[PDB]
Design a protein around this ligand. Structure first.
Ligand SMILES: Cc1cc2nc3c(=O)[nH]c(=O)nc-3n(C[C@H](O)[C@H](O)[C@H](O)COP(=O)(O)OP(=O)(O)OC[C@H]3O[C@@H](n4cnc5c(N)ncnc54)[C@H](O)[C@@H]3O)c2cc1C
Length: 500
């Protein structure tokens, strides 16, 4: 008796999972011949390549637990194997007598490298590998091919290409396993009945004092519930315009499906279908790029450019990226990182990020503009790294793609348009309710100066119980001065990149 193995990495769902469904149908179409091991490998190597904050660890813990629970309802279970794939797979290929290995493809460089080696090993041991592109709606390889070898670098061109592509068929959940016994304990399982159990919170989250509120629980089950909840107002869905949603509403102004789509607890292809059904029902609706389908296409767009550039997350050796002289300033980077810049709007956002792990799209605009071309002149690679740690929806391609945009390094080139850290939030939150929440030490400043507390006289600062320089920092820079200087810096950079 040989085993069929589905390998989870992303695609942490049961629904719309061709690679997992295939394993399950195979076992039921040939009962008595196959054991079924759906695994997730706790890979220590990813930590040398990416940073993970406490809140995102918790999300994953919650995801794996839900995935295990959902697998049990199909007479299976999640096997969480600790260890490196390069050492894990030779062992289990033998100990398990693995006939077939399936998994969802991924375009990230670490994934590509790791997957190539696993496929070299699988080819040696005579293991059949079947891969599926289901993490995105479109296959970046096919998009690039259709565009004659190059990723479209504008959204409109990208849209014109995928319009001509076949939308894939969205699968349901696999059928339950018919008459399958529990796989026999292997070398590891016999010395430890729990060697493959889902990790506890204690095991994954080493810094639990950094956990913020539990608002967006992980797992395919919460993902589908949140999707259904977001689709209940079909008018809000059909008339969604992303630029008109607020960054600083106390309640999220968008769906906050990003963490779910990032881990694949929600199939983007299912989400897209559910959106097409509402658009069809609602004749007055928005169109890309501002619509919600448009939002999913921004995801697809950035996955496609990133599939073409292994260096997508850095400035050097990145085909798309303007080379800019970003300066090193540790102290300003620390202040930004910890929301101690002295600009209440920026600080409020960066504290919401660190506490909760999600901030609105245009709040990320604000704080990223400030770090890079706006104000501090600090490389976008540094904002990407802080974002990588803190974001529940951390996504190699989406994080890099949007930082290059916000920094006018690629895709976006109108660097003369600069967000004001004082003015930008006022449009949607003139009372500063968002600042009061996330910068509580300013909670007693009236609207007139809560965005600019340095316009309050010292006497009033003592009356509101927050003296700048003691209870809340002074501005680490003066926006009105640095942003003008930075525009000239950006113009010089653009000139140099144009002549090379
Ligand atoms: C500096 C910066 C960094 C970012 N880093 C990430 C990141 O690491 N991971 C991430 O998922 N998004 C990232 N984004 C894009 C965007 O901010 C988030 O996708 C969005 O805030 C998620 O909230 P939502 O799910 O309510 O979005 P909605 O507006 O509800 O959109 C639904 C989905 O569409 C996709 N989407 C929406 N906007 C974008 C966009 N601009 N680019 C790409 N896909 C988009 C996401 O999958 C999102 O879940 C970043 C943007 C900026 C400016």
């Amino acid at each position: 008796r040989s085993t069929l193995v589905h390998w989870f990495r992303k695609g942490l769902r049961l629904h719309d999972n061709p690679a997992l469904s295939h394993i399950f149908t195979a076992a039921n179409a040939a009962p008595g011949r196959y054991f079924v091991r759906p695994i997730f490998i706790l890979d220590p190597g990813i930590l040398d390549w990416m940073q993970v904050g406490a809140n995102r660890w918790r999300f994953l813990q919650q995801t794996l637990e839900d995935l295990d629970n959902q697998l049990r309802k199909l007479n299976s279970r999640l096997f969480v194997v600790r260890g490196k794939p390069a050492e894990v797979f030779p062992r289990i290929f033998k100990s398990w007598r693995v006939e077939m290995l399936t998994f969802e493809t991924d375009i990230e460089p670490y994934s590509v490298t790791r997957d190539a080696a696993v496929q070299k090993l699988a080819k040696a041991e005579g293991v059949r590998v079947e891969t599926h592109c289901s993490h995105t709606i479109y296959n970046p390889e096919l998009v690039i091919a259709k565009n004659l070898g190059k990723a479209p670098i504008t959204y409109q061109k990208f849209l014109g290409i995928v319009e001509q592509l076949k939308v894939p068929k969205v699968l349901g959940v696999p059928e339950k396993l018919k008459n399958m016994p529990t796989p026999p304990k292997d070398e590891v399982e016999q010395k430890d009945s729990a060697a493959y159990d889902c990790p506890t919170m204690k095991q994954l989250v080493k810094r639990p004092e950094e956990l913020g509120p539990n608002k967006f629980p992980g797992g395919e089950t919460e993902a589908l519930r949140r999707m259904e909840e977001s689709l209940k107002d079909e008018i809000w869905v059909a008339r969604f315009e992303k630029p008109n949603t607020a960054p600083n509403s106390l309640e999220p102004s968008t769906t906050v499906l990003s963490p779910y789509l990032k881990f694949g607890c929600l199939s983007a292809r299912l989400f897209n279908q559910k959106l097409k059904e509402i658009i069809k029902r609602q004749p007055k609706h928005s169109q890309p790029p501002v619509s919600l389908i448009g939002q999913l296409m921004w995801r697809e767009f950035y996955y496609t450019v990133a599939a073409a550039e292994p260096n997508f997350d850095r400035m050097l050796g990145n085909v798309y990226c303007m080379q800019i002289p970003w300066q090193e300033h540790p102290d300003h980077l620390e202040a930004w990182t910890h929301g101690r810049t002295g600009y209440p709007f920026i600080d409020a956002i960066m504290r919401q990020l660190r506490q909760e792990g999600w901030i609105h799209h245009l709040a990320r605009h604000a704080v990223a503009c400030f770090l890079t071309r706006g104000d501090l002149w600090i490389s976008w690679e540094e904002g990407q790294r802080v974002f990588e740690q803190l974001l529940l929806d951390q996504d190699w391609a989406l994080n890099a793609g949007n930082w290059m945009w916000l920094s006018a390094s690629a895709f976006f080139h109108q660097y003369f348009r600069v967000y004001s850290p004082v003015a930008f939030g006022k449009k949607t939150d003139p009372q500063g309710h968002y600042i009061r929440k996330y910068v509580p030490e300013l909670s007693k400043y009236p609207a007139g100066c809560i965005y600019e507390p340095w316009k309050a006289s010292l006497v009033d600062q003592r009356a509101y119980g927050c003296v700048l320089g003691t209870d809340y920092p002074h501005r680490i820079v003066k926006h009105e001065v640095v942003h003008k200087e930075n525009i000239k810096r950006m113009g010089a950079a653009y000139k140099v990149n144009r002549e090379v």
